[PDB]
Amino acid sequence: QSKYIGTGHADTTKWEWLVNQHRDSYCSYMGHFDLLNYFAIAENESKARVRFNLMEKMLQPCGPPA
Amino acid sequence: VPVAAAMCVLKTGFLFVASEFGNHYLYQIAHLGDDDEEPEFSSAMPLEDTFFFQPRPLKNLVLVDELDSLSPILFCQIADLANEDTPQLYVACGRGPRSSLRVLRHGLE
Amino acid sequence: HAHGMRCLGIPNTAHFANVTQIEDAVSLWAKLKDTEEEYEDSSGNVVNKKTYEDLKRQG
Amino acid sequence: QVAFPLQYTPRKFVIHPESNNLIIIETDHNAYTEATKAQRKQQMAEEMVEAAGELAAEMAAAFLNENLPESIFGAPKAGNGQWASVIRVMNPIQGNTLDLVQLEQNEAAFSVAVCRFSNTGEDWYVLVGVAKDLILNPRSVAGGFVYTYKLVNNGEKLEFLHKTPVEEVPAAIAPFQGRVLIGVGKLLRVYDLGKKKLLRKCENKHIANYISGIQTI
Amino acid sequence: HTIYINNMNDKIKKEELKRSLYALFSQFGHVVDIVALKTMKMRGQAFVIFKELGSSTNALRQLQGFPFYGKPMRIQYAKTDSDIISKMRGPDYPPNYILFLNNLPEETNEMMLSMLFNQFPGFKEVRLVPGRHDIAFVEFENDGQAGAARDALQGFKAMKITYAK
Amino acid sequence: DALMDRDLVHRQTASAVVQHMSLGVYGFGCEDSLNHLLNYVWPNVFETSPHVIQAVMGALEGLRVAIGPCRMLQYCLQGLFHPARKVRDVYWKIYNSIYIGSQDALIAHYPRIYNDDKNTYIRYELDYIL
Fold it and tell me: Where is the RRM domain (chain E)?
């Protein structure tokens, strides 16, 4: 369980849980060709630049911790 | 060329282009495109400035084929606006400047 | 308890089934507790229903 | 198929029954409408000569004279808050564009509806819901607007009627019982036609998050 | 709630002035307090404060130009709220000088509302005349006078007059 | 009748029944009644008896695959942050069981959670509208 990333426990903080679901959402975006293409349509960029901005947002999201 | 999500290169002067969106394209190489006035940049050329250059049509290539691409399909309406009884598919589809409105009928070309 | 609430003016419902002090539930109860009828000059799109009815009686 | 070229990326289109034409809404993010590329065009044109070099040599006239096919070189487009929104009256039978409506800089139009108010007559209407100043990823706006068009020449011509402001972006527009439903943001509202601007004949503030789309039996 | 009086005979001693002022104005409602000084600046003047606002309006209309110790007094609504009122009690245009509303019919009319509005030097706009005779639009040069007229008939048994807030 | 408890073994064994039923029926469209039974399953979550707790675990796992995660998670939300230690221990155990499998499909079902000062908790990607 521990070595499986995303494992929660009783002491789990807000920040960690939400940054988890963030990163997992981003791996889903990298995963599904379409939804990615939807993103590229809406905000106009390349598929590439989209995935790049996401890979930048992987570590950050929500910004600094508390 | 229009933005290609993936590129396969074939022997005997061929270039395949599958665009990220809009029609696919098959290109053929009629010239290696060297040796002329076209500036050929180096990594050691002096500056600290970025070397510029002029866009233009294809002078290194010829366009063999254009493959039908519906994606992305933004909006779809099936309605019969013509004389016959078979409904035509009016589809607003495309990406950026290349976006277009296409009509689908039931036929081979 | 409900007599103190309701007679106090704080209506009796679960919402308030926590806090004891008289004060805080007063602000809580304060937390508990507009159409356009188009005049003919095309400016009355800001004008209220009842107001335009008053201008019906005036017109 | 048959392919009819366009400029910006259409978000939707609607049937006009009697004129039997097609109204297309186009929008592009990071995009510059024609006149915008004209003001940046002339902008760089001016900023060229100011290098004060021998003045004599002008690439400006040829560069501006150069107009590239917008499909082959793609988007001459960048910038965050900028947008492009165009409307089109196009024939279904052939590919000719009957009319072209070229709107403001930042205003993106996410909805359009064509109907006839029960109070007025057979006069057609083109209602284009429009957003103002999208800041896309935080979420905010400067506000919203709605444009109205009478759809004339039996529906073969458009004319701007009025610009009616609204606090929020309309995400959809649908006709209901001879009048026009508009949800805006999370607020659902029943609108009726004013001859200067629209007025609200009802509202509901309950819906928590946001209004995506609306259908009406 | 407070009325400003000027044009008073300044020869009366201060305590006598205040006591006659209290007596005279008691006929309209309870007077909470009276501020009157004999400094150069303030001589010949007084602020009379009433518990009820209707009392202030009635006083203003009924005693305008009343001979007091030999001179005709001039009354007006005060510019600001009295300190005592603010303490006893505890938007940007308010107080406004344009009161539009209706609920004042009954053969009422424009020369009627024009003379009632006329009472006030602020008499500027008066709109009461259609078959209605019940929609009153009153533009009073300034809110002291609009407030004076409004405070004078502030409960025309109930009419509705709504400042152009 | 059985899951409503006369004595623990009823809840246990009946729960096992819910499990094997839940794996067996998968994908055929009967989920409704399985939701109803999940109601009565749900209170048994709390106990220290090893066989009934592991039984209930198997139960809610089969119910996970049959019903789909969305409904599960909608029962498992509030228990995560509840003040008590017990409730958090358990609902986090459950939420982990729901989390490991079908982690790919959970994305849609995380609710909207407002953003605080130092952190932005809204994922705006889903709000991009054409």
Answer: 1-80, 97-165
